[PDB]
């Protein structure tokens, strides 16, 4: 399975010196469940081309654990190298057209499932199957508060 970094969904914190994630309790009083990833280095695969085990947890990870418990399968989650959601590069320069990023990794046979905030539209649903929505949403704009000091 391949996942991508996202502010509210998936967190990526460095593991402890021992090799296990630092168990931290939540506010409700339940132990937070975390999974260990195998993600790329700090910046990119460009200069520091090397993978490192990290810690992953969040909403998508909890849903993944729930599914793995309810239908009894196993998984080995790992991040995406390109760090892009996915786009079909069809430049006529190389006479070939192919997907990049998460969809490029999925279609190439690297992974079997994508548990991440992947949207639904025509071009992406043309090639792969999309399950029922797990959260509804939309598109909006974000600005900085003026804080009127008149």
């Amino acid at each position: 399975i391949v996942t991508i970094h996202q502010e509210p969904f998936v967190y990526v914190k460095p593991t402890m010196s021992d090799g296990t994630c630092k168990e931290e309790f939540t506010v409700n009083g339940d132990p937070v469940k975390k999974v260990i990833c195998t993600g790329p280095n700090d910046t990119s695969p460009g200069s520091p081309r090397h993978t490192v085990p990290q810690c992953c947890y969040g909403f998508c990870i909890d849903l993944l654990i729930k599914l793995a418990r309810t239908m009894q399968f196993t998984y080995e989650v790992h991040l995406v190298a390109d760090g892009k959601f996915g786009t079909q590069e069809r430049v006529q320069n190389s006479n070939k057209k192919e997907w990049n990023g998460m969809m490029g990794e999925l279609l190439s046979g690297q992974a079997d499932m994508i548990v991440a905030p992947l949207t639904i539209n025509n071009e992406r649903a043309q090639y792969i199957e999309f399950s029922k929505p797990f959260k509804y949403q939309g598109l909006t704009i974000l600005v900085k508060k003026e804080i009127p000091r008149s």
Partner: peptide, 22 residues
């Protein structure tokens, strides 16, 4: 320190991707 402003458009939820047949 930031505020979201506007009305929503192009509403499409998040779905779990998967292969052509499985």
């Amino acid at each position: 320190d930031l505020v979201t402003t506007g009305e929503l458009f192009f509403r499409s939820g998040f779905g779990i991707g998967m292969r052509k047949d499985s």
